[PDB]
From Swiss-Prot:
The modification N6-succinyllysine is found at residues 203, 434, 517, 562. It is found in: Secreted. The keyword Ribosomal protein does not apply. The record marks 197 as: Aspirin-acetylated lysine. Disulfide bonds join 51-60, 73-89, 88-99, 122-167, 166-175, 198-244, 243-251, 263-277, 276-287, 314-359, 358-367, 390-436, 435-446, 459-475, 474-485, 512-557, 556-565. This is Albumin. The record marks 2, 18, 39, 62, 71, 91, 104, 134, 157, 172, 179, 188, 193, 203, 210, 238, 260, 272, 284, 357, 370, 387, 400, 412, 430, 434, 464, 473, 498, 517, 522, 536, 539, 555, 558, 562, 572 as: Not glycated. Zn(2+) binds at residues 65, 245, 247. Its main location: secreted. The keyword Glycoprotein applies. (4Z,15Z)-bilirubin IXalpha binds at residue 238.
């Protein structure tokens, strides 16, 4: 078109246009005050409106990158506030914008955003609803410069709905609070996954990414032809590559194009794209990415026919190794949407290895004939882990379950920091409840989606402050042996217990007046500390001490005299316990 600006305005709409402009500027000029950005957004918005009325109006023809960069260099304190970045303005558009991307701070040092009081929030909302949401939109954006703008906007709207509903409730807090905790966790998971996909692409390369995408896509579209999956896996890989680099526009168009291609060739891909393809430009991509698995054709022949028994398997394999393997993946994937993606790549890798040994032997059709038999143990392992952990989670309840893990992992890596072991075991328990609630069918895939982010959030910490060679062994290992490696860890027999510390086991009656969250985090921290002091304790010796401490609380926080009870009755517990646990 003649006007790129007028064009984006026209289909985005004024409301979405304005919110995206704000997020965009906030992600670059992360140091300017909110009132400053509002000024820009309005400036840009009024311009856009000019072009929509006459695509010929001066400058209406400039490119978005050009118009954007031009406005960015308009900032007067640019050099004084950002310094080096101001030098970008000396370059010409190809490099200028590339320069801006470079000087983007992924982890700025801004103060943690504290959550105000429901009533203060609801009142700010009611008075000035817009500036309330835009002010917070701007605060999240400057802190997460690499969060895909359109998706940040999708969360924004979900927030506006919670305040809309809850601030009318008789019991606002009971309404709002649990919704905000939910949204918080979601956006955090989304942020991590997005940062994870770009990391792997860099570390493991295109091949591994391609295989992950193939198994992934073949699961959602079991009816498409390998040729179609091939095409998509190809465009997709370019999209993530683009998107990871950073340019919002390049990444936005790449996704739009691919979303339209999928919708046009819809009948050629899946039957569950009905909705997503009827949706607005801004939501088409996001919808599709979240789409449910299409029913896999019911008429699907065997795999042993084309991969184990037929004779020219080596002939077809040597001719094009990757397409053959991609074919195995596609076939096995679309047949098993109840498998995690890493389980599939774990099977594909096993097969590849086997073909490499046999296609170079007297009679291969008999060297690789017992491969499928080697898949059995690979599949049963993650499966036996799910039942076992969901069975347990059922006999205990989230909290009591989180406690079981605590004892488990503290024993494995006692070297790890207590506040870390607690945070980790808490997130694991959450995964236990978020997934064990599904039928066998969707369990494994659920666990992988969640476990993936936790294991990495956990590995990144260790990165900054190493502690155990072992946790480093698994953290550096292949993204396919990441989880299996952690499950393989064994009780540390090397570790040397910590010297007693009464202060660590001294409780004053403030716990009785603390929130559930706080009481638990407090009892849980003593638990980690208790295991670090007496590592060889039994599940019995422990369950006992935990019973005595259990009652204790009730006896001192339901008694006329608190701190005395907590200091006179307490001395009794530690004295007895210290004896029981030898
Ligand atoms: C996303 C942009 C919409 C802004 C919604 C404002 C949310 C209130 C801020 C709460 C702090 C976050 C938290 O700790 O839960
Ligand atoms: C100012 C320019 C902002 C451009 C925003 C376009 C976003 C288009 C959404 C399409 C998608 O879902 O990928
Ligand atoms: C706590 C919840 C326990 C979940 C069991 C772990 C199974 C992991 C399956 C993912 C994979 O195949 O690597
Ligand atoms: C830090 C402590 C490491 C915790 C290991 C997390 C691995 C979770 C997989 C579940 C399992 O097999 O136990
Ligand atoms: C050296 C022995 C000191 C005894 C201290 C006991 C601390 C254990 C706290 C465990 C609390 C379990 C939580 C619960 O009962 O719900």
């Amino acid at each position: 078109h003649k006007s790129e600006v007028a064009h984006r305005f026209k289909d985005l709409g004024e409301e979405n246009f304005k919110a995206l402009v704000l997020i965009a500027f906030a992600q670059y000029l992360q140091q300017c005050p909110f009132e400053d950005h509002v000024k820009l957004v309005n400036e840009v918005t009024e311009f856009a409106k000019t072009c929509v009325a006459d695509e010929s109006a001066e400058n209406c023809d400039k490119s978005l990158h050009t118009l954007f960069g031009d406005k960015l260099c308009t900032v007067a304190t640019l050099r004084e506030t950002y310094g080096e970045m101001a030098d970008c303005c000396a370059k010409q558009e190809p490099e200028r914008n590339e320069c801006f991307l470079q000087h983007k701070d992924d982890n700025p040092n801004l103060p943690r955003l504290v959550r105000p009081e429901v009533d203060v929030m609801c009142t700010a909302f009611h008075d000035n609803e817009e500036t309330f949401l835009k002010k917070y939109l701007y605060e999240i954006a400057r802190r997460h410069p690499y969060f895909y703008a359109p998706e940040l906007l999708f969360f924004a709207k979900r927030y506006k709905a919670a305040f809309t509903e809850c601030c009318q409730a008789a019991d606002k807090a009971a309404c709002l609070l649990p919704k905000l905790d939910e949204l918080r966790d979601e956006g955090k998971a989304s942020s991590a996954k997005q940062r994870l996909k770009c990391a792997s692409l860099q570390k493991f390369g295109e091949r591994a990414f391609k295989a992950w995408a193939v198994a992934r896509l073949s699961q959602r579209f079991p009816k498409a032809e390998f040729a179609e999956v091939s095409k998509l896996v190809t465009d997709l890989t370019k999209v993530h590559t683009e998107c990871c680099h950073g340019d919002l526009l390049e990444c936005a168009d790449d996704r739009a194009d691919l979303a339209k291609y999928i919708c046009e060739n819809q009948d050629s891909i899946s039957s569950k794209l009905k909705e997503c393809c009827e949706k607005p430009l801004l939501e088409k991509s996001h919808c599709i990415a979240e789409v449910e698995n299409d029913e896999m054709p019911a008429d699907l022949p065997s795999l042993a026919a084309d991969f184990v028994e037929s004779k020219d398997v080596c002939k077809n394999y040597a001719e094009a190794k990757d397409v053959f393997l991609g074919m195995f993946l596609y076939e096995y994937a679309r047949r098993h949407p109840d498998y995690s993606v890493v389980l599939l790549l774990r099977l594909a890798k096993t097969y590849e290895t086997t073909l490499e040994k046999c296609c170079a032997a007297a009679d291969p059709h008999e060297c690789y004939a017992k491969v499928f038999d080697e898949f059995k143990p690979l599949v049963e392992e993650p499966q036996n882990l799910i039942k076992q952990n969901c069975e347990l989670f059922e006999q205990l309840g989230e909290y009591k379950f989180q406690n079981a893990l605590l004892v488990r992992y503290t024993k494995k890596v006692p070297q790890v920091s207590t506040p870390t072991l607690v945070e980790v075991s808490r997130n694991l328990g959450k995964v236990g409840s978020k997934c064990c609630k599904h039928p066998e069918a969707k369990r494994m895939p659920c666990a992988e989606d969640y476990l993936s982010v936790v294991l990495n959030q956990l590995c990144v910490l260790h990165e900054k402050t190493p502690v155990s060679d072992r946790v480093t062994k698994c953290c550096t290992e292949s993204l396919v042996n990441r989880r299996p490696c952690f499950s393989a860890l064994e009780v540390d027999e090397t570790y040397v217990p910590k010297e007693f510390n009464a202060e660590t086991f001294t409780f004053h009656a403030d716990i009785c007046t603390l929130s559930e969250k706080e009481r638990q985090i407090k009892k849980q921290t003593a638990l980690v500390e208790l295991v670090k002091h007496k590592p060889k304790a039994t599940k019995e010796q422990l369950k006992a001490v935990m019973d005595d401490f259990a009652a204790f609380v009730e006896k001192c926080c339901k008694a006329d005299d608190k701190e005395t009870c907590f200091a006179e009755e307490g001395k009794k517990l530690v004295a007895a316990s210290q004896a029981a646990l030898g």
